[PDB]
Amino acid sequence: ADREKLLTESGVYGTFATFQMDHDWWDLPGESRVISVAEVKGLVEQWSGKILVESYLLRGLSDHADLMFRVHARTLSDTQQFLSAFMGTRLGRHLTSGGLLHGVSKKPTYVAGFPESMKTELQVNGESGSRPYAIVIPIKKDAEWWALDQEARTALMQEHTQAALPYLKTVKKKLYHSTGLDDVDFITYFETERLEDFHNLVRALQQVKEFRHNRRFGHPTLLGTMSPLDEILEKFAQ
Amino acid sequence: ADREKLLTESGVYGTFATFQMDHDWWDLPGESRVISVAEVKGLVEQWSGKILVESYLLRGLSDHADLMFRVHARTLSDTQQFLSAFMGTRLGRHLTSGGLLHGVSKKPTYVAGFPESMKTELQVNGESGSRPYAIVIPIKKDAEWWALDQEARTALMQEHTQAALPYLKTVKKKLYHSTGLDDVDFITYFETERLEDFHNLVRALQQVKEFRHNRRFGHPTLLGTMSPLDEILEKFAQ
Amino acid sequence: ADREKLLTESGVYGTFATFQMDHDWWDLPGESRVISVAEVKGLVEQWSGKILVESYLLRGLSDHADLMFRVHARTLSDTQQFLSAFMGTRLGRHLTSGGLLHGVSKKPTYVAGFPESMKTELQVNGESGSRPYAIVIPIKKDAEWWALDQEARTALMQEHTQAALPYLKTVKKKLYHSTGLDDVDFITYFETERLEDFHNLVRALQQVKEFRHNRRFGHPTLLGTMSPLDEILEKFAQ
Amino acid sequence: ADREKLLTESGVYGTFATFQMDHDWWDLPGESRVISVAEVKGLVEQWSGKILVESYLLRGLSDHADLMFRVHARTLSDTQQFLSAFMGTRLGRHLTSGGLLHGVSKKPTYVAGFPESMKTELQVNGESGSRPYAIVIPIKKDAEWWALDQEARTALMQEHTQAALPYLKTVKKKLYHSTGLDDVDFITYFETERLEDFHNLVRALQQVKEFRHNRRFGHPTLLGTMSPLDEILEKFAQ
Amino acid sequence: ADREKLLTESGVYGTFATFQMDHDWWDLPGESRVISVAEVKGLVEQWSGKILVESYLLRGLSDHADLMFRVHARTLSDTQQFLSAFMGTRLGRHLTSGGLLHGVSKKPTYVAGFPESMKTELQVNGESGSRPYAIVIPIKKDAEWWALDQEARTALMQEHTQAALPYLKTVKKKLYHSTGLDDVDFITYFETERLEDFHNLVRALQQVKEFRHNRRFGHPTLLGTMSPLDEILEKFAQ
Ligand code: HEM
Ligand code: HEM
Ligand code: HEM
């Protein structure tokens, strides 16, 4: 049950941590690599009490990245401790740590001021699938966005939501509030079985006025496939 | 036959993947390097059922890049699997993965709203040559482009098309729709025997109004020569 | 006592120095690594006469960074000597020097020209806690900022102060005057037990007019946990 | 004779290729390094039928660069083959490939529409010296430049030419048309015995209106001394 | 005597060359390192006829840099030859060459058009001290700056000079004209015993109108301590 709570409640920290495997990892015998895989698996299980970790194969879809973790935790200290432990494991020691981003899941700022019919649609349940594609786009707003008053921003977000609703059927979403914890304002996360829909979703959004206030849109756009840890690591132990 | 379908149909994913060879690859004896070349060849043939892979020599033409693949696949998960397997082969283990870009081949958005005479010319068959030069330019449009209405954009694309038609005789083209799959909106790909013509084509297009809406033009501009995999890898096995 | 003087007086240089550990550090036997940890410890104690050094675990919270020092000194030459010595120790030789930033603690330029009631609040003592989160944001102002007259800038800083006072309860702060000693105008430093409050503080400040004059805001935003040196280094000696 | 044709005719490709020598090159015994020098020398001679290669010592004058080649070829394929071969030689294998740029020598676009007296001066023969300094500045024009009509651009280039004529006495020049082959529009190349004159030339040019249309000016500005290959490589074989 | 002439006359080239020491330098035994130090010292003395070289400890004050040389020479060829020789010594072979910049010392452009009382002050002798701090800021002016007419620029530089004169007492200065020799227009160099004064000097200058025409200001800002070569290298031979 508590797994659900970290994935849906407000006040939960979400961290996105990317990694790439050193060339010299293959110089290890295959035996060593499988023992190393074992260690990592154990570490994750030991932390399963305090935090939830999900894995993604970025290798072959995202540039300069093999593995990503999405870690949910009630305090970032625990995430620190886990990631430090992880990077210390023998597998971890052969990993070049890529990007790292943090944000807190929060209660919605503009949605209360939307129409009632638009609130119903947002409550509708979309993509419920295993092994979907996963996308992460960090976002930074311009100065102009903050200078706007609440009514203006609420209007712009309503246009945003309107453009995107049709795609809630096949695309799942989650928003993290990132300001002050790194160099972006939000982290956006998505799961979909249909990449061409996701493409059309992003295209629809590029046409709303709100879009021009995204001072940073991507860089990087992370694309991968959701997968259990064992399957990912197994690739490397062969 | 099916080869043609991947290269021409809509809904096919095209991935562009560049690589550079580690200094330490030459520390291997020449025998090891020829065995490794054999591995890679086999892997490509094994995947020949599900995806089409084409190779280009970037070495000596594109900075910080030796090899590029253009991979066509009906699903990006298969491209992932292939590239992951590839990067794992002995040869793959000595390659530093450069850029990686994806886009879907789609049905034309503005071409129906062009004049009939302009539609005839666009259907005309241009460069049919082996071992041609190949160019890849990623493109990102500005906010202002999306804010325009459909009629304005159609107008601007018609100007684009009119500027470029004369060059269809000696330059082949293909457009991939990239938004949401990485940090660019389109990936453009070109084959030509005459680089001087391609130069004059890009020069003609810098003069149309549409051009100023390319927030990102190149970076990198990839230039190479199309070539069978065996020839390219054989260079490295000597 | 004199520890306090360095952390509170004007004319004290604060230097911020980030580091990341080489992959090849783990090729050393665990014995060697414990020896090396000993060395660094000693060097820090030796310099404890002249300068104060504080340590932060960036590992797992800040991208491409494992350790940060905040060094206080009355002359930057001493900081130079200490950092140079540190980088020479065996542990130091396996560290890739990340960013480096300096600024001087100075007497306040605008605060005399604020209201009396606003001066009371600024004097009030906030976060007094061990092992808190620590954030560093380097800042560069635009040309327009400097072109403003004193009255205008004072007005804008009063707005900044007003927005931020409520957060003095749970967030500690320190300002360093960096201009001329590197490529930023200010280094901002913060300690907090409550990241969510820090987030809301930076969000409140993004809405004051002063904010649009930050030509550089972050890049990098350094996030970590304050910790004694032996705990941090101990992680690496295992 | 044919050497002249490549350096003066239109339709000749000029490639600019920079390299830096790996630290571990000195770990080779001095014998090995002289044998390697021999290899490279021979390769250049073997290609002397199809292409012209000239060498420059960038070491000590241009940052992060030791050697530059200026290669002239009637087809870029041949330059590819040569540079690939070169990078493969033992000396080549210890070189980190810096930048790489291409452009075609072309017949002048605006000079026919200049006054007759200004055409006379442009025909006059300037710097005829061995071992001169060499400068390469890549250039990218802004959108605005292309949007101008021919008459406006011709007018601006006439101002450019006028400002720079006095310096034709001591500064030799050549222009390569680079658009579409990489990320710059032009490659500018210069030889001079008098760097202070070159300085004053570039100063004179920063004052003409055309200058503000250079979206990219330099980055890098390459400075070196022209020298035969054997002299340059000899430095490294010691 | 002639030492003065290089440091004061017009037409002398000044080159700024920064270096960082390889990790693997400390794998050498301490004997080898002191022999290496001897080599470099000798080379400098051998070139003492033709050029003047001054050293700065950048380690611990400037990021990614240990050593800087300021070389004065009547011709840049001689600087090239020296720096090449230097990089070739055993010490030199374990150095990663950082930035490199050149400029010529020239007669003042605007000073003749200043008031007489302002000319008197500029003649006054300021900081005469051994082992001072040294700062280098490269500067590139915007297009706008060049488009101004002489009278406008002279006006702006008089404001610049007025702002700065009070600091001539404690800060020594030198200007190198860099355009065409690299990617910047000027190289500014400063010596001071009082960094806090230098800070206030740069702050006073950020408020004059001229300052908004500095398209590039720093990047890097190099900060170090002036010191004899033997002291600096001795640190490394321990
Ligand atoms: C699946 C379809 C989507 C739906 C139904 C949707 C809905 C919403 C809603 C209701 C909010 C307001 C939250 C609040 O009240 O505070 C929001 C915010 C936001 N959305 Fe979406 N969204 C979708 C897709 C996307 C996409 C594709 C992106 C970018 C890739 C994106 C980026 C953002 C960002 C950055 C915010 C924060 C508010 C802001 O823009 O400043 N969303 N979204
Ligand atoms: C070889 C001759 C060329 C022809 C005949 C041609 C024609 C066209 C046509 C007809 C379209 C519209 C298709 C649609 O409606 O979706 C188009 C789109 C596009 N083309 Fe070209 N083109 C040529 C060369 C180029 C070149 C050299 C570039 C850039 C290097 C380029 C970049 C683009 C881009 C980025 C689009 C996306 C539509 C947009 O701008 O929003 N094309 N081109
Ligand atoms: C904890 C609540 C905060 C308070 C009470 C506060 C207050 C102040 C005050 C009173 C000054 C004026 C000092 C003077 O006159 O010299 C100042 C300056 C400054 N503050 Fe804050 N601040 C807070 C948080 C922040 C944050 C979160 C940032 C940025 C991340 C920040 C950035 C700056 C900067 C860069 C200056 C430099 C002076 C200038 O703006 O020109 N402060 N702050």
Ligand code: HEM
């Ligand atoms: C040495 C004295 C110089 C002379 C006599 C000179 C003369 C000319 C002439 C006649 C043209 C027009 C050719 C045509 O019709 O296409 C031209 C173009 C050009 N010049 Fe120069 N030039 C000189 C130096 C320089 C320098 C120092 C630079 C920049 C570092 C430079 C940059 C260019 C560029 C980029 C073009 C391409 C045309 C354009 O601006 O679009 N030239 N020059």
Ligand code: HEM
């Ligand atoms: C120590 C106090 C300073 C004094 C007394 C001073 C004075 C001057 C004077 C008299 C000139 C004109 C010389 C000529 O005719 O070329 C000048 C030019 C110049 N100065 Fe300063 N200066 C000082 C500090 C600085 C500083 C701190 C900087 C920036 C870090 C700076 C940057 C420049 C630059 C780039 C020019 C070139 C003209 C231009 O801006 O286009 N100077 N300075």
